[PDB]
Amino acid sequence: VLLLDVTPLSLGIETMGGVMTTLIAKNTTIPTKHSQVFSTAEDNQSAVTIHVLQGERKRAADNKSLGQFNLDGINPAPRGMPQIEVTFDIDADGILHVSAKDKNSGKEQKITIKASSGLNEDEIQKMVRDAEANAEADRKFEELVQTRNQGDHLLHSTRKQVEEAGDKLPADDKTAIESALTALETALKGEDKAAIEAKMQELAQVSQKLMEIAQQQ
């Protein structure tokens, strides 16, 4: 054949730290369907937002938003443990159906995105060239995000542990922990991997008595 009807750009969803995760690759023939299992970003997260994106960039913010919906009622669990199956199905009319289902709770939500949605022909070409020009930067970004996400997880577990510790935690330690949490927060907004890892360390150094407390029966 000299003509194939295809989805012109990659389609996927936003995942923790502003990353596009692709479910259907650019230039896939239609009709087509693919599924991938995702999980929660934080301990005891009760809901997830499925932000649907079209484009080739690894930074979610530089792709085209097609829609979003939420799925709630996720039962309490450690982050990473719930199984949220997300399915993209593009039919022969180019209509995109996106669903998310939590395997433990059985709850599901879906949206339908009409075929005219997303980028036009001129924006499609610009997008492909944009991603080609930014391929190395986007590699660096994904590295930065793995470190940001560790940073983010430590900040949350530490805050949870301070709450649970309450007045068992000495006043000098809480002050030092508070400062170090704020510092980690600030670093996480920059693009410097070493700076994040550095504040993670500074937080750990003031956290020994806390770790001891969290650890006992």
């Binding site: 995942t15 999980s39 970003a41 937002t49 996400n149």
Partner: peptide
């Protein structure tokens, strides 16, 4: 293994 999803945005602070 699985990639992680963000939570819905709460009301503005």
């Amino acid at each position: 293994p699985r990639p992680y999803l963000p939570r819905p945005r709460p009301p503005r602070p």
